[PDB]
Structures are given as C-alpha cells and as structure tokens.
Amino acid sequence: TPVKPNYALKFTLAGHTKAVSSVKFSPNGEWLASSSADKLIKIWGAYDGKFEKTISGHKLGISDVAWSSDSNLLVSASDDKTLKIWDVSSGKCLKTLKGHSNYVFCCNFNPQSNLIVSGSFDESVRIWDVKTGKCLKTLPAHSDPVSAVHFNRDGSLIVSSSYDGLCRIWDTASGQCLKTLIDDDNPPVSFVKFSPNGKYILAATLDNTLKLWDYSKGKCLKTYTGHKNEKYCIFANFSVTGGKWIVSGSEDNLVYIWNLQTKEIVQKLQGHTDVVISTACHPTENIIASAALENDKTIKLWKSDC
C-alpha cells in the first residue's frame, strides 16, 4: 500500500573544500553534478557516488549548476557575475555568459536546451542563447535578488522567485510577465520550480514554509511545514519515482520528506552537520542526493526500497 519511504545513507561524497551550494542528477541517470563556494564543479557517479572529475574555471564561488536535456552540457552560475557552459565529457568551458552586474545565483536550461535562464543579485532574469553565448533578453523581473528560475516542460514559460516576496511567470518568447502569484503576505520567496506534470509550482518562503500552487488558477493547494528555513535559499523537489513526496533541505541539518497529498512528514534524514542547502531526486530510481554548508561540505546519497 502507499507505504512510507525508507531512505538510508549509502554514500558520503567528500572533496569540496568549501560549502557545497547545489547538486543535480543528470537526466540520463548516470551522474551527479555539484557546485561549491570553492569555485569548482565536481562530477560523481549517481549510483555509487564515485568521484569522476573536477571542472574548473570560475574565478569565484558557484551558487548553482544545471544539466542540458541530453546530459552532455552543464551551466553554472557564479559570484564572478558570469555563467559558464561546460562540455561534461571534456571538462572544457564552451562559453562564458557575460551581462549580469552582480552575483549570478540560479540557472537552468530549457527542455530543448537551446536556451539558458539565469537569475542574479542584480534583480534581473536573463535569457541566453546556448549556441552563441549571447544574452537574448534581460527581464526587469524583481526588486531584490532573484533566488530561482525554472522553465516549464515545453520551455514556453519561466517561473522566477525573489527575496522581494514575489513569484512571477514569464512568457519565454516575448519576455513579458504572464502572472504574479502573491499570497496573504510577502515573505521572501527562496525557491520555485515547476512540477514533473507541468501543472504546479512548488515555492519555498523564508517563513519555514513550502507551498504547492496551481499556477493556471493562481491558488495555493498544499502547505508543508515542520522544517527550518528562514535564512538560506534551499532547493526543494518533487519525488515521483516511487511514492509521491516533497523533499527539501533544512537549517536544522536534516532532509525532510513529506507526503504530497496529506502534507504529513514521512521521513527526516539525519547525518549532515550543517544546513542542508540542496537536495535532488534521481530521475528513475528512488535515490536522493543532499549537500551541506561550511561545517560539513559533503554530499550524501540515500536510497529507498520504495
């Protein structure tokens, strides 16, 4: 029956020399990519955590990394005010994306992987051409740093979030705003992403709350609480390979897993020794990756039987 998951620690991935900022599984399921304040990207085996390579070139720390759909490219977002596009097999920087005027905080490819979206401390969202490395559009999107950016499943929409308390949905082709989601209040919105069915947006706010939104109708459907999140922009996820969960890091050093429908906490994963800034869910297997800040600096791989 829909039984609770039993995620258990299988591997701990050491090697970053400063806080880890982001981990992401490759769409083909083979790899995990991590970014860090240490200015490095590392690649690891998705199933056994095996260290594969280090990818270097940024001049300052990296806050986010993201895969192309074919698992061959990565893009990274850095305090050096650039994004870089990387060929994962060679480790070579293909393009440096220049235009932001402050730290680049978040990034993603669209599904066709001909575009990249970025968000920055400069309060803008930018849309970039992967082939040329040119900025196509600069959106005056927010009135505070942009914490997250994500394309929907056909690349026609971008969702963005900001410390200004807004979540906005943009038309990719024109760069114009389709919708602003605001609630009864405007705590900072620290993370957003579209759901695997394209229908919902998951949004984190720095009042220790996650919310599931129907974005067509513009309304909140579910609220998830019990974790600690008032300071950091922590990644959250839909887990869909087994039971239907919401997964998030927490400032009490735990990974939280909720039942998406009932909103109950079903598991808390103990082991990290600093804020769990990032979690990710494997595309086909019941595997979670988590990563933590300065006092820990490791990535952990957890596996469940369901």
Binding site: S21, I62, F121, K231, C233
Partner: peptide
C-alpha cells in the same frame, strides 16, 4: 557562493 544567510542579501 552568495547562496552558501542574511547579511549579503541585505547589504
């Protein structure tokens, strides 16, 4: 990494 508390975003 700006992502890796409160002080930078309020500075």
């Amino acid at each position: 990494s700006a992502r890796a508390x409160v002080h930078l975003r309020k500075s």
